[PDB]
Design a protein around this ligand. Structure first.
Ligand SMILES: [Mg+2]
Ligand SMILES: [Zn+2]
Length: 216
């Protein structure tokens, strides 16, 4: 069956008042809300995801001496004895747990609360980045996502939300790797990068992982 995953539709990403606004992100609120309620889409289940960071999170530039937001940083595997590394971006503080910024945007939250929609939080471990809604960048900690999808007989995963080139892409790739027929509905996503070229690049990467990219 089909599960819709709505990725990180949170204030810090969507509102201009947010600390890490996705350009044109406000355009997604109503259409995604409509998508969630559209019976023609045959959603057996909907899952919404949230970045759920502590203020001391390793991904915030603020928590690093002599490093400013949007700078590059070398992350180190948290497993002891493992010494591999990954290139990453240090960010402005965003989606801190229990703050306005980490709240699902009103219109989505309203749906989640009244329809009792499953929430998956990621990014709460201080020591690592966590783009994918399925597991951290090391594939060390997993969320309950996969188990939830399995319980609910999911064979098709549809992904919408923000940011196209980060949490959306990472979640889509996880879903495909785990054997779900995965689709990204492009029109229901936005990149953080105000660069039109970024859309094409992601499109190609997704297709290379056998993920369907359609507009609507
Ligand atoms: Mg802003
Ligand atoms: Zn984040």
């Amino acid at each position: 069956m089909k599960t819709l995953i709505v990725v990180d539709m949170q204030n810090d990403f969507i509102s201009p008042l947010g600390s890490l606004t996705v350009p044109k992100g406000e355009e997604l609120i109503n259409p995604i809300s409509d998508l969630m309620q559209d019976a023609d889409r045959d959603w057996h289940r909907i899952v919404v995801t949230r970045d759920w960071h502590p203020s001391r999170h390793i991904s915030f530039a603020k928590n690093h001496k002599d490093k400013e937001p949007y700078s590059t940083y070398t992350y180190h595997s948290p497993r002891p004895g493992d010494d591999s590394t990954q290139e990453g971006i240090l960010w402005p503080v965003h989606c801190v747990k229990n703050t306005w910024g980490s709240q699902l945007v009103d219109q989505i939250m309203d749906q989640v609360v009244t329809k009792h929609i499953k929430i998956v939080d990621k990014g709460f471990l201080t020591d690592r980045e966590y783009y994918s809604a399925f597991h951290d960048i090391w594939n060390f900690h997993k969320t309950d996502m996969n188990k939830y999808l399995e319980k609910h007989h999911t064979d098709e995963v549809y992904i919408v939300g923000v940011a196209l080139e980060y949490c959306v892409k990472a979640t889509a790739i996880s879903a495909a790797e785990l054997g779900y027929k995965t689709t990204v509905l492009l029109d229901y996503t936005r990149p953080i990068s105000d660069d039109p070229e970024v859309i094409n690049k992601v499109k190609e990467e997704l297709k290379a992982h056998n993920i369907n990219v359609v507009d609507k």
